[PDB]
Amino acid sequence: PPEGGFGWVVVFAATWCNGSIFGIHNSVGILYSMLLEEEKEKEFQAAWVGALAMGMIFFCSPIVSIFTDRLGCRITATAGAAVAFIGLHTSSFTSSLSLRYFTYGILFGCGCSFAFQPSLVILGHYFQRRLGLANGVVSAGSSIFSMSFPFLIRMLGDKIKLAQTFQVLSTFMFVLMLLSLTYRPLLPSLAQLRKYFNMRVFRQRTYRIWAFGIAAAALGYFVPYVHLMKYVEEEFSEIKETWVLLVCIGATSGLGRLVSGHISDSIPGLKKIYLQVLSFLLLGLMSMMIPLCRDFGGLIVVCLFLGLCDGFFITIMAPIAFELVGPMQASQAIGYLLGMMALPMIAGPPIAGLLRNCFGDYHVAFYFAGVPPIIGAVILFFVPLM
Amino acid sequence: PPEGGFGWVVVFAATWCNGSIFGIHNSVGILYSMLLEEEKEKEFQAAWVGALAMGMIFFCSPIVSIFTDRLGCRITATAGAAVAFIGLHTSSFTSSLSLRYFTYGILFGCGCSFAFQPSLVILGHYFQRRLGLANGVVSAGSSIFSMSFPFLIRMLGDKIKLAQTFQVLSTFMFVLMLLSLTYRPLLPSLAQLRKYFNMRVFRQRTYRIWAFGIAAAALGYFVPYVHLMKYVEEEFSEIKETWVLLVCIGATSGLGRLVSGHISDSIPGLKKIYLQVLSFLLLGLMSMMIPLCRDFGGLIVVCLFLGLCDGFFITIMAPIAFELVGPMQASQAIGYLLGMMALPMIAGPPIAGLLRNCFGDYHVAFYFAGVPPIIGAVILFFVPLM
Ligand SMILES: CCCCCCCCCCCCCCCCCC(=O)OC[C@H](COP(=O)([O-])OCC[N+](C)(C)C)OC(=O)CCCCCCCCCCCCCCCCC
Numbered sequence A, B: 001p002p003e004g005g006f007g008w009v010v011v012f013a014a015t016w017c018n019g020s021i022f023g024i025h026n027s028v029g030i031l032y033s034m035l036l037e038e039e040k041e042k043e044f045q046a047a048w049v050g051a052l053a054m055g056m057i058f059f060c061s062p063i064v065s066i067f068t069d070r071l072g073c074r075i076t077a078t079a080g081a082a083v084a085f086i087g088l089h090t091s092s093f094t095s096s097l098s099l100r101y102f103t104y105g106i107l108f109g110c111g112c113s114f115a116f117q118p119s120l121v122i123l124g125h126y127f128q129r130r131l132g133l134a135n136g137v138v139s140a141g142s143s144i145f146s147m148s149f150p151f152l153i154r155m156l157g158d159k160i161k162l163a164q165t166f167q168v169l170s171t172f173m174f175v176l177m178l179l180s181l182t183y184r185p186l187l188p189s190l191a192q193l194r195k196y197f198n199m200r201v202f203r204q205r206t207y208r209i210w211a212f213g214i215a216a217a218a219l220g221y222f223v224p225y226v227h228l229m230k231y232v233e234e235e236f237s238e239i240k241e242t243w244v245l246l247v248c249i250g251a252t253s254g255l256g257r258l259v260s261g262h263i264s265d266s267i268p269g270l271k272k273i274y275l276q277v278l279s280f281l282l283l284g285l286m287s288m289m290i291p292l293c294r295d296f297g298g299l300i301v302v303c304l305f306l307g308l309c310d311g312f313f314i315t316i317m318a319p320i321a322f323e324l325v326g327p328m329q330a331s332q333a334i335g336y337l338l339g340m341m342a343l344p345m346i347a348g349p350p351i352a353g354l355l356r357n358c359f360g361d362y363h364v365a366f367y368f369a370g371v372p373p374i375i376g377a378v379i380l381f382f383v384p385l386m
């Protein structure tokens, strides 16, 4: 492992992936608004496709792993980038409703998953000892890029039209393909289903319990951002532009990603899991103490803490997987962990909204968002004892 | 050399290049017409950029060769395809006059040259004994694809608009990039200018005289198609749709490409050059006997012969270069031959038009188009004597 050098170049490519994928998805809602402007001059489906894209990313990793194991990081990443580019291109072309849904959701999500998992796998390939620092740098850069995307996307959208926006996103995907072409391998590479789906990583019950804890904790991850924005917009009004929450969340999340990437490098072994546990607990608390402040003063601090803990957890995830299962079978571990997190991630916000509708208040929604992090914290705390 | 097998796959990729490049250029005029439709609702520059693109292709081969020698066929071809894709993309975006000229001409032509020369070089890499057959197949397929392009291009253009057309051409270029990624190498790979521009191939005076003859002959290549169409449209009117000439030219050119690719495989050595000489002479005659028939009956036959000879010469070119200079330095020979042909090719049609304007009749234009082929025939006839 070079521990740097050309690895840094790979890191750049890795960044250009998270950033792009996740930024083109954080902007999905904006696109729909533009579609509404084009819906006239001649139903509630935006959320369905918006969640379908990310859900497809997560659901298709259990398989992207099969490939990256067999084919390799470069081939899988390039194929995913190509599929994403074609999805965006065909979305630009077609002017319809069902075909747009199929194209965007299926093609873009599948390509995004294929281009996303090999990035983490190759990052592990190169450093293997400073993996914490590399993951922190990648997370911080990707966060900055993803935040930056909506501004330009909305300005272009207000400028001309939707198809041009899809063209711009497609060229972004093309540049991602070109960069992903740099994942130079550095490590050795009826019964067909039994060899493609060996599920050998699911032995070593420490990984099993770790994955269970992460999956349980992910059930309350996507609530306290979208629901927090909708709740501050609806309740806690009479405030000026309410942008402080978003900006502080982003800044502290980036700083926490960098800091956690750096510090995780120091802890010897499975003690790294403790870094998650702590953060997990905080997350839960930082949710349960969101609606207890009558003024925005407490909201600023709670949002700062929320973003810091989010960055901690996000950047910490992958190095722990590589330490747990080793480098040879880290791709399978990452893929199956993402697949397991797939369902709670999409099931969280819907449950929060359903509870809000049933009770009419966001209190229960935020409490139920905060509890699963604590449950996962307990499970992960028990993990390293063996 | 496999003499086939995976080489055939490469052949397919090779086809997808000529076809695309040359088809997107044969359609350039159509695009300008569409621009004229968009010029209203709010000068004579079409020919300048249309010729600039092809001229840039030819002018930049003397260098593309340097690269393909040093970097390799795959890297150079992929870079050229990427530059072409970005050129088409930015042409789709910008709505102006000077920026469109710069983008299309410079970017598209440079990318086209970069993606074009390595195709021939790799075709030589793989077969090396059936190179005649491979070149014939490539030429026939590329001719069919290039003649097919204008129909779809014009139908889409009449459908919606120009930017969508540029998007479609850009995705064509992207597919060309993906295919060009298959050029797997099979052969070993103040003073900086003296090593990058060694010009070692320009020894072995047989190659020198061959290149001189080809350059002289190319001076009268592009006249008897564009000027022939304009002359049949202007003079020889009262005829139904005048499509017989074009269709017969294309069909016989494809058939001749295939047949010459096959037969050239049989001639042992430098005797292959004779195949050019013969065809060259015919070309000249087939020009000088264009305006001597008062009815279209002779025109059909003369066009058939013209297309047959054109296919002969086009498909024959490269195998002779590989036989002459060998496989190691065939890339430099091809690149410098293309660079030398660059100037007469662009200087021919302008001289034909100038003579037509000065005299007012196409007779002198066609005579001067036919003579240079005969001069080149004489030179190439003298070539193999040594
Ligand atoms: C302003 C202008 C800017 C210009 C832009 C910049 C241009 C310069 C950059 C050019 C790029 C750099 C050159 C690239 C070099 C590439 C060579 C290389 O590195 O190796 C190639 C790489 C690896 O080659 P390799 O050489 O390294 O292989 C290593 C093995 N040894 C060591 C033996 C050589 O090739 C690949 O493996 C990539 C395969 C990816 C396959 C993708 C195809 C998937 C298709 C999916 C289907 C999509 C269709 C969807 C269907 C939809 C249906 C509706």
Ligand SMILES: N[C@@H](Cc1cc(I)c(Oc2ccc(O)c(I)c2)c(I)c1)C(=O)O
Binding pocket: A022, A120, A146, A218, A221, A314, A315, A317, A318, A334, A337, A338, A341
């Ligand atoms: N807030 C994020 C959303 C987001 C959150 C989580 I947990 C995700 O799963 C990860 C993340 C990092 C890893 O190293 C691994 I292994 C899995 C993903 I993929 C996305 C965003 O939208 O950018």
Ligand SMILES: N[C@@H](Cc1cc(I)c(Oc2ccc(O)c(I)c2)c(I)c1)C(=O)O
Binding pocket: B022, B120, B146, B218, B221, B314, B315, B317, B318, B334, B337, B338, B341
């Ligand atoms: N009629 C063609 C025009 C065209 C004619 C000639 I001569 C060209 O130079 C070649 C051709 C084949 C070779 O093997 C070599 I080496 C050089 C090119 I490039 C294009 C078309 O427009 O398709």
